[PDB]
Design an enzyme around this catalytic site. Structure first.
Site, PDB file in Angstrom:
ATOM      1  N   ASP A  31       0.918  -1.199   0.053  1.00 32.12           N
ATOM      2  CA  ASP A  31       0.073  -0.286  -0.109  1.00 32.12           C
ATOM      3  C   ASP A  31       0.703   1.319  -0.094  1.00 32.12           C
ATOM      4  OD1 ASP A  31       0.728  -0.056   2.741  1.00 32.12           O
ATOM      5  OD2 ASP A  31      -1.381  -0.405   3.396  1.00 32.12           O
ATOM      6  N   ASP A 406       5.012   1.536  14.167  1.00 30.84           N
ATOM      7  CA  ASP A 406       4.137   0.323  13.994  1.00 30.84           C
ATOM      8  C   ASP A 406       4.967  -0.913  14.675  1.00 30.84           C
ATOM      9  OD1 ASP A 406       1.756   1.353  13.049  1.00 30.84           O
ATOM     10  OD2 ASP A 406       2.218   0.666  11.012  1.00 30.84           O
TER      11      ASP A 406
END
Ligand SMILES: OC[C@H]1O[C@@H](O[C@H]2[C@@H](OC[C@H]3O[C@@H](O[C@H]4[C@H](O)[C@@H](O)[C@@H](O)O[C@@H]4CO)[C@H](O)[C@@H](O)[C@@H]3O[C@@H]3O[C@H](CO[C@H]4OC[C@@H](O)[C@H](O)[C@H]4O)[C@@H](O[C@@H]4O[C@H](CO[C@H]5OC[C@@H](O)[C@H](O)[C@H]5O)[C@@H](O)[C@H](O)[C@H]4O)[C@H](O)[C@H]3O)OC[C@@H](O)[C@@H]2O)[C@H](O)[C@@H](O)[C@H]1O
Ligand SMILES: OC[C@H]1O[C@@H](O)[C@H](O)[C@@H](O)[C@@H]1O[C@@H]1O[C@H](CO[C@H]2OC[C@@H](O)[C@H](O)[C@H]2O)[C@@H](O[C@@H]2O[C@H](CO[C@H]3OC[C@@H](O)[C@H](O)[C@H]3O)[C@@H](O[C@@H]3O[C@H](CO[C@H]4OC[C@@H](O)[C@H](O)[C@H]4O)[C@@H](O)[C@H](O)[C@H]3O)[C@H](O)[C@H]2O)[C@H](O)[C@H]1O
Ligand code: CL
Ligand code: CL
Ligand code: CL
Ligand code: CL
Ligand code: CL
Ligand code: CL
Ligand code: CL
Ligand code: CL
Ligand code: CL
Ligand code: CL
Ligand code: CL
Ligand code: CL
Ligand code: CL
Ligand code: CL
Ligand code: CL
Ligand code: CL
Ligand code: CL
Ligand code: CL
Ligand code: CL
Ligand code: CL
Ligand code: CL
Ligand code: CL
Ligand code: CL
Ligand code: CL
Ligand code: CL
Ligand code: CL
Ligand code: CL
Length: 685
Positions: A31, A406
């Site tokens: 993405d 993350d």
């Protein structure tokens, strides 16, 4: 050799797996970080889009990837990101499996957004299996487009659907090449990312007209696949588009000879489904994955999606990922305790359909023996790096330490070795990190709270208080005793003399997201460059107060200015369209670096042998060429150290370049979606 990555492994969302059903070539798309080919000869992923310049960062968002059933050399991507480069979108065409691409800009006809909701749905770009010159492309907002010249130009084929509430539009296109006239496939199935209206359609006239056929418009399709014999279309669907929404769903199959739909949802469990795959040599052998389910206690160690297998066309199913499965970390220790989630694409390996790959928000996992009773899933990410890196430090004589979104970041004695652990505790990300120049065991990092370490990052203790908010940029004085900190999204920098037991404002209240910098030599000296005011603020009292220097370096540069080892009072400032300047006298005066018309980031590294100044690295434009440059003579001369094939979209979110303090020539750069890239620019061999 020259170009590479700090090793971490995956760490972001792989949004689709695509394999060639004849040649067995395997690719994936992401993405935020381009696409990859699986090099099965050497067992590593090969990035395909590292050539995108900073005018092409957009193409790191890959919305679809299509192969040509008749010719495995052809590869097509639909690439674009709404928030970069004006949303510029292209069909990227290759005739050599992605080694080289031709760019076909399509923005004014249709746009793509690789980071959209619904991004794991697909594939919406497809090649006619009877005619290599014909492609169709469903789009998020502009209808169904086609090309009759192998992707070089596009025209609107059908507009019965254009826009949907979720922005995702037409989300799969599948040909049935048993239906052909004039060498043009006449039967095309499409899916639409909406509920409450028609959302699976069939054309029998080559895409001119479509008839709705879905059995239940309560669910929208995510993915569909036609069996090799053309007899059966399998469809995964859910009540949202994914990857992070959808609360229920179904698996259906369509037997094309009679138009017969069967609800084959595993066990009637009605989870949201996204991934589906069929064995190219056996219509009845299928596997599916849920997408946005979380109630599977995978390996007994984590929570995420489910995988179900059937050998009888979906009449009955066996779970293939559960608490009895095992996770093969493949030497990447930090992935233990993590698992498979957002699993919107699953794929039988065509060369051996005992093997299955599945996507995840943290990479890709592979089960090499799906027939085992207790399945083993391997974190299969060698060559792939997708994290968004936000800060880092290189300690002379010590470790390299990253601060990563993350996946948090790690401490490295060898940046090319995969970490056993990532920094804990962390909430979501670490966004700032610092060490004390003359007390190098002392490190601090910023997540929701500040964490201090006395063992160079091996263990951590929370600050007693984190003033203002988390996630800010940070500096430690050379002696390690004072911390300066500006919380993210705030404009006041504070100082503490006791590891956050108490805080006091520095008096600098007008520098949003300030990046405080400690002098390496003088433990009482700090600097803050303010893009908005153009000032270099300097403190000589350990942060208690700051004053602006006599001459401003100028406005609208990067806040990430750099001090210089062994050179008290020296600061380099990347001024964006104002070029590059440095001071040697605390900002009383500045040297304009000739020939640098733009500089987005500056970093310092180990001096060349025989040189008298640390090496300087920039991402910028030197004599009209944008790229990465090194100077070993205090900015008098520069050499380009990247190349046109290695641009990665530029410095991206973390917006930094930094040199290694121990390895001459090594430079690190942040990216939008390719982890922390490295250049080993010392080309002596
Ligand atoms: O909320 C959860 C939800 O997010 C959906 O995605 C949308 C969401 O993305 C947030 C960030 O995604 C993150 O990627 C994830 C990825 O989605 C994961 O699947 C996985 O792979 O991990 C990665 C990493 O975590 C990206 O890393 C992150 O960049 C996305 O955030 C957007 O970032 C844009 C780019 O800017 C950043 O990077 C370049 C630096 O130069 C910038 O400093 C830095 O901001 C932001 O766009 C930028 O925005 C500024 C300011 O814009 C504003 O002011 C001017 C107005 O005209 C604008 O309209 C206004 O917004 C611009 O000046 C600049 O030009 C532009 O580049 C962007 O604002 C920021 O959100 O949010 C954005 C959506 O497009 C995504 O679809 C998921 O779909 C969903 O599943 C779920 O995760
Ligand atoms: O208790 C088990 C299980 O029981 C189910 O019944 C229950 O429904 C589940 O909630 C529960 O599992 C936990 O589910 C949440 C998601 O929960 C939400 O969705 C389901 C709803 O029912 C629920 O009410 C919602 O709150 C999981 O959280 C997701 O975790 C993944 C992975 O996170 C790991 O990797 C990153 C690291 O930072 C974490 O520490 C680690 O756990 C996240 O995925 C990553 O997301 C980022 C992008 O972030 C953003 O998009 C989503 C948004 O929620 C998030 O706040 C944003 O920041 C990407 O960059 C990564 O690539 C991607 O991997 C999800 O974001 C996060 O929601 C729990 O892990 C799970 O135990
Ligand atoms: Cl392999
Ligand atoms: Cl194929
Ligand atoms: Cl072929
Ligand atoms: Cl042909
Ligand atoms: Cl032609
Ligand atoms: Cl239209
Ligand atoms: Cl809609
Ligand atoms: Cl029609
Ligand atoms: Cl078949
Ligand atoms: Cl049919
Ligand atoms: Cl069943
Ligand atoms: Cl079940
Ligand atoms: Cl669930
Ligand atoms: Cl079972
Ligand atoms: Cl996880
Ligand atoms: Cl190293
Ligand atoms: Cl860990
Ligand atoms: Cl020391
Ligand atoms: Cl402490
Ligand atoms: Cl000191
Ligand atoms: Cl400012
Ligand atoms: Cl100014
Ligand atoms: Cl000085
Ligand atoms: Cl630096
Ligand atoms: Cl080149
Ligand atoms: Cl390039
Ligand atoms: Cl060299």
């Amino acid at each position: 050799q020259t170009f590479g990555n700090v090793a971490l492994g995956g760490g972001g969302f792989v949004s689709g797996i695509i394999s060639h059903k004849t040649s067995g070539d395997v690719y994936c798309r992401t993405d935020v970080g381009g696409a990859y080919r699986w090099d099965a000869v050497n067992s590593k992923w090969i990035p395909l889009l590292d050539w995108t310049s900073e005018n092409e960062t957009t193409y790191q968002g890959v919305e679809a990837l299509a192969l040509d059933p008749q010719n495995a050399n052809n590869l097509y991507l639909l690439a674009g990101t709404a928030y970069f480069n004006g949303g510029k979108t292209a069909i990227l065409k290759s005739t050599d499996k992605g080694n080289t691409f031709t760019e076909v800009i399509v923005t004014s006809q249709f746009t793509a957004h690789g980071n959209r909701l619904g991004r794991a749905n697909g594939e919406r770009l497809a090649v006619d299996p009877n005619n290599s010159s014909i492609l169709f492309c469903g789009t998020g907002a502009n209808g169904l487009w086609k090309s009759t010249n192998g992707g070089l130009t596009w025209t609107l084929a059908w507009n019965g659907v254009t826009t949907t509430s979720n922005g995702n539009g037409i989300c799969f296109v599948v040909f049935d090449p048993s239906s052909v006239s004039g060498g043009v496939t006449q039967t095309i199935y499409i899916g639409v990312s909406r509920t409450g209206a028609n959302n699976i359609y069939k054309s029998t006239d080559g895409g001119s007209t479509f008839t709705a056929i879905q059995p239940d418009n309560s669910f929208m399709p995510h993915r569909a696949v036609l069996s090799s014999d053309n007899s059966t279309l399998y469809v995964a669907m859910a009540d949202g588009e994914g990857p992070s929404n959808g609360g229920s769903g179904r698996v259906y199959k369509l037997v094309t000879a009679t138009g017969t739909w069967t609800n084959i949802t595993p066990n009637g469990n009605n989870f949201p489904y996204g991934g589906v795959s069929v064995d190219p040599s056996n219509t009845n052998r299928i596997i599916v994955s849920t997408e946005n389910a979380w109630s599977n206690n995978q390996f007994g160690a984590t929570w995420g999606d489910f995988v179900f297998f059937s050998a009888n066309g979906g009449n009955t199913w066996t779970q293939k990922l559960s608490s009895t499965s095992t996770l093969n970390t493949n030497g990447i220790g930090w992935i233990a305790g993590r698992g498979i989630h957002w699993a919107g694409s699953i794929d039988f390996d065509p060369l051996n359909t005992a093997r299955v790959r599945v996507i995840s928000g943290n990479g890709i996992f592979t089960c090499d023996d799906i027939n085992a009773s207790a399945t083993s899933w391997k974190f299969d990410v060698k060559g792939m790096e997708e994290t968004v890196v936000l800060d880092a430090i290189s300690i002379p004589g010590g470790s390299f330490i990253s601060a990563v979104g993350d996946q948090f970041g790690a401490v490295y004695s060898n940046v090319y070795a995969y970490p056993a652990k990532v920094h804990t505790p962390t909430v979501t990300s670490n966004n700032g990190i610092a060490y004390a120049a003359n007390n190098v065991s002392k490190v601090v990092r910023a997540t929701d709270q500040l964490y201090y370490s006395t063992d160079q990052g091996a263990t951590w203790t929370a600050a007693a208080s984190t003033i203002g908010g988390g996630y800010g940029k940070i500096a430690l004085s050379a002696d390690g005793n004072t911390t300066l900190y500006c919380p993210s999204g705030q404009s006041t920098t504070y100082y503490s003399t006791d590891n956050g037991g108490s805080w006091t404002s520095t008096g600098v209240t007008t520098v949003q997201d300030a990046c405080p910098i400690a002098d390496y030599v003088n433990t009482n000296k700090f600097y803050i460059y303010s893009p908005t005011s153009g000032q270099l603020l300097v403190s000589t009292n350990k942060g208690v107060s700051f004053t602006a220097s006599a001459v401003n370096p100028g406005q609208w540069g990067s806040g990430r200015a750099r001090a210089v080892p062994d050179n008290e009072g020296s600061v380099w400032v990347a001024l964006n369209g104002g070029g590059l300047k440095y001071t040697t006298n605390n900002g009383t005066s500045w040297t304009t670096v000739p020939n640098v018309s733009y500089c987005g980031a500056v970093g310092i590294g180990k001096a060349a042998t025989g040189a008298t100044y640390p090496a300087v690295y920039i991402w910028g434009t030197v004599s009209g060429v944008r790229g990465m440059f090194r100077s070993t003579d205090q900015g008098a001369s520069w050499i380009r150290i990247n190349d046109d094939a290695h641009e990665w979209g530029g410095p991206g979110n973390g917006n930094f370049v930094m040199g290694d303090m121990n390895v001459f020539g090594r430079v690190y750069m942040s990216t939008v979606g390719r982890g922390l890239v490295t250049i080993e620019s010392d080309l002596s061999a």
